[PDB]
Amino acid sequence: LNLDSIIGRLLEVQGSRPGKNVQLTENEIRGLCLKSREIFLSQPILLELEAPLKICGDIHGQYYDLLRLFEYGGFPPESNYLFLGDYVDRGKQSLETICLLLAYKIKYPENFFLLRGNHECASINRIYGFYDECKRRYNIKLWKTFTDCFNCLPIAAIVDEKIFCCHGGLSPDLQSMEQIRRIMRPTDVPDQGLLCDLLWSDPDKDVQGWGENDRGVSFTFGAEVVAKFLHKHDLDLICRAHQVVEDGYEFFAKRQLVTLFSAPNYCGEFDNAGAMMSVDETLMCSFQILKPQFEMDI
Amino acid sequence: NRKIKFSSAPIKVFNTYSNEDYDRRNDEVDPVAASAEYELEKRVEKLELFPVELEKDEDGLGISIIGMGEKLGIFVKTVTEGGAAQRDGRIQVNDQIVEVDGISLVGVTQNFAATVLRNTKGNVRFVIGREKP
Ligand SMILES: [Mn+2]
Ligand SMILES: [Mn+2]
């Protein structure tokens, strides 16, 4: 397993200049994938978590930002953590990021949780960096191994039966939570349907009801849809990610939905800051901001 | 009705690496190229793959290939009558050449595929893909 050895090496670059890589062995990574995969399937696809807890958004391979995320929020098991997906792609150190998160999940399965983002899908990360990073620093067989692990990540989490958490947002097909729980793993993320929307959909102020999403997949939803959703299921907040917000956090539909993003200066093309959410035993919510055609005969 | 609350206390702003300290840019990502490769890979997954082993004769392997998309796939256009491929019978027109001597020819460049097919010898090991019924 080498779990303590793996984590120690991953944290050894804390004080180095950012960009320095940590090269784990192929077998160690495969161990982390095969064992985290085992835990993911032993736990419900729809998580039921209890406070205290800290909620974080996209990372996208910005490994050192994840460290400062842990440094200020408290390394595990000092604090319980729930991530909303998008750990890989668009960054130069996705492998370090996902390994550290998977290691903590194996080490602290009941106090550390990871949700599936739209980039934890083979059809997407094959294009936006993770496959290339696996090919360069390992073999593509390792990328297939990450796919089998990602296909078993949980989709959504409900905190204290009152806060609903997922990467993307709501779906017009979502009537009861049993529709989520019936989803069987391992599964790819289809181009359409409930699972797709949970990982892709966005809130939009200018939309009444449902609307088409500029990403070319899934939909956009307005404030009324949020309020009705919370009313019908006796919830009071939707916590999600998947959109860059300049202040690391951003509310929507009064205080009924919040967007979290934990990758400062997203892929070096934004000014945005990162942020996280802390929920205590009394369900108090606070914000910590991480501000910087051919032929041939044979 | 609500059982949650929110904090009016000030917001804590911890500092983080600048852009000079931490260069988060990544110009290596090339979605256009990867997407072209991935589309070819998707088609192969839906194909019926079977092995084939041909012994080269005087004429060669008796196969004529065509590239189809940059990132190309290798398909059979002609099977010369009397050649090794025809006499074997398992290779037919429009069969994709997924692998040759263990080297993948899905989403490759014409230069790459030509180099591989020119370096074959004697008993060439093929992986052939055919459209499922
Ligand atoms: Mn996303
Ligand atoms: Mn994202």
Residue numbers in the entry:
A (entry chain A): 7 to 298, 1113 to 1118
B (entry chain C): 454 to 522, 530 to 593
Text lifted from the article:
Phosphoprotein phosphatase 1 (PP1) is a member of the PPP superfamily of protein phosphatases, responsible for most cellular serine/threonine dephosphorylation. Structural alignment showed that the Phactrs belong to a small subset of RVxF-ΦΦ-R PIPs whose shared trajectory across the PP1 surface continues to the edge of the hydrophobic groove, making an additional PP1 contact through an additional motif that we termed the ‘W’ SLIM. These ‘RVxF-ΦΦ-R-W string’ PIPs include Neurabin/Spinophilin (PPP1R9A/B), which play important roles in PP1-dependent regulation of neuronal plasticity, PNUTS (PPP1R10), which regulates PolII and chromatin dynamics, and PPP1R15A/B, which mediate translational regulation through control of eIF2α dephosphorylation. Biochemical and structural experiments show that in contrast to the Phactrs, substrate recruitment and catalytic efficiency of the PP1-Neurabin and PP1-Spinophilin fusions is primarily determined by substrate interaction with the PDZ domain adjoining their RVxF-ΦΦ-R-W motifs, rather than by recognition of the remodelled PP1 hydrophobic groove.
In the complex, the PP1 catalytic core and Neurabin PDZ sequences were well resolved, along with the 4E-BP1 PBM, which was docked with the Neurabin PDZ domain. The individual domains were largely identical to those determined previously for unliganded Neurabin/PP1 (PP1(1–304), RMSD 0.22 Å over 269 Cα, PDZ(501–592) RMSD 0.39 Å over 65 Cα).
